[PDB]
Design a protein around this ligand. Structure first.
Ligand SMILES: Nc1ncnc2c1ncn2[C@@H]1O[C@H](COP(=O)(O)OP(=O)(O)OP(=O)(O)O)[C@@H](O)[C@H]1O
Length: 67
């Protein structure tokens, strides 16, 4: 199974409302070198923090797993 398994990905920073991100569905398996590119401020650092759990997720089905 993919280690980074995200279905909803409704990331947010404000504890009440204000979703910082939504509709994020990524399934990245282990040993998959995936470089991320994008525009300035287009949910890069926020996505990285949400991957480690540093960002509040409102509606997201995440099942973290390893080998
Ligand atoms: N912990 C946080 N709490 C609130 N807002 C945040 C937090 N972390 C990032 N943000 C903001 O949310 C947005 C997400 O942008 P993104 O994650 O792409 O930033 P970035 O990768 O640091 O951008 P840049 O290209 O400017 O370096 C930005 O406006 C950023 O300032």
């Amino acid at each position: 199974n993919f280690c980074v398994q995200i279905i909803g990905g409704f990331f947010t920073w404000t504890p009440d409302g204000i979703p910082t991100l939504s509709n994020i569905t990524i399934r990245i398996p282990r040993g998959q070198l995936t470089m991320i590119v994008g525009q300035v401020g287009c949910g890069k650092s926020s996505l990285l923090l949400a991957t480690l759990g540093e960002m509040q997720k409102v509606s997201g089905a995440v099942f973290w797993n390893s080998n």
